[PDB]
DNA sequence: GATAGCGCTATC
DNA sequence: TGATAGCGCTATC
């Protein structure tokens with residue numbers, strides 16, 4: 023994550039819904055905002071959240087009386103996506119895990135926050151031809167908020183990962199927020215190879231497999247893109263190998279394949295999966311953040327998490343706009 | 350709870 | 362197209 027000196031969000035209070043690892047907190051907090059409430063029903067996730075922020079998130083948001091949610095200026099929420107991902111049964115709103123947005127809508131209706139910050143996968147935009155997004159746009163407009171949606175890729179904001187996500191920023195209409203913008207992209211000056219751990223610490227993750235084919239030669243020069251070198255087995259999800267000289271593929275939560283949730287990378291003639299912390303970094307997390315003890319849960323957590331760095335640039339601009347109140 | 354084979358589907 | 366991908370889904374122990 024990036025260090026920020028102009029705390030645009032100072033004095034503001036925010037809510038951390040669907041917290042998971044707490045990435046949204048890390049972001050807004052770096053900009054001077056204050057976290058007043060957090061919600062996350064997964065046991066193990068609460069464990070890491072606690073492990074890193076003291077408190078322990080509250081349970082099932084679908085059964086929390088919104089009247090109970092603390093006063094707050096910005097509502098943060100990266101809601102479930104198994105329901106809209108390019109990688110699943112796009113059952114959208116029909117899927118139980120795909121209704122959570124409306125839970126948000128009723129948190130917003132009651133607490134009427136100044137800003138509504140949401141995150142989800144790229145597919146969300148076009149899912150169901152584009153009606154799902156539309157339902158969210160109108161629901162927000164009908165709640166009297168503006169709707170600023172755009173998809174950004176992590177590799178355009180200082181982090182080596184081809185992770186494209188849809189970011190939705192909502193300002194209450196009262197305030198005439200009309201100068202808000204999404205961070206402009208910029209040169210990628212860091213690659214997988216730069217975030218790795220010494221072989222001394224990865225040995226255990228190396229996977230030698232006879233069925234390891236090799237369809238592309240290692241690259242010498244770094245690229246702001248993921249480059250597939252080899253493959254194992256049938257070459258499906260988590261069976262693909264990439265050049266650490268480029269950028270990492272998207273991390274996933276319920277992912278499979280021998281290189282489950284991280285993907286295979288070629289390091290010094292060997293083929294292996296990333297380390298819980300190599301992920302942490304790949305996701306923009308400061309090495310000072312304590313990961314969950316259960317490696318599996320760890321990978322799962324960073325899987326649906328958010329790239330801290332990205333949220334920062336957005337969070338910064340949210341404040342920039344909020345703080346512009348001329349006479 | 351931890352593993353791992355997979356079987357579509359975005360997109361260009 | 363033909364090649365690459367994906368906050369996923371499942372079964373098995």
Ligand SMILES: Nc1ncnc2c1ncn2[C@@H]1O[C@H](CSCC[C@H](N)C(=O)O)[C@@H](O)[C@H]1O
Nearest residue numbers: 040042043045062063082083100326327328
């Ligand atoms: N009803 C519910 N109540 C609380 N959390 C829920 C929930 N349904 C899903 N979730 C949680 O939704 C989260 C979506 S992933 C969001 C990740 C988060 N922005 C981060 O940075 O870690 C998951 O952690 C999942 O456990």
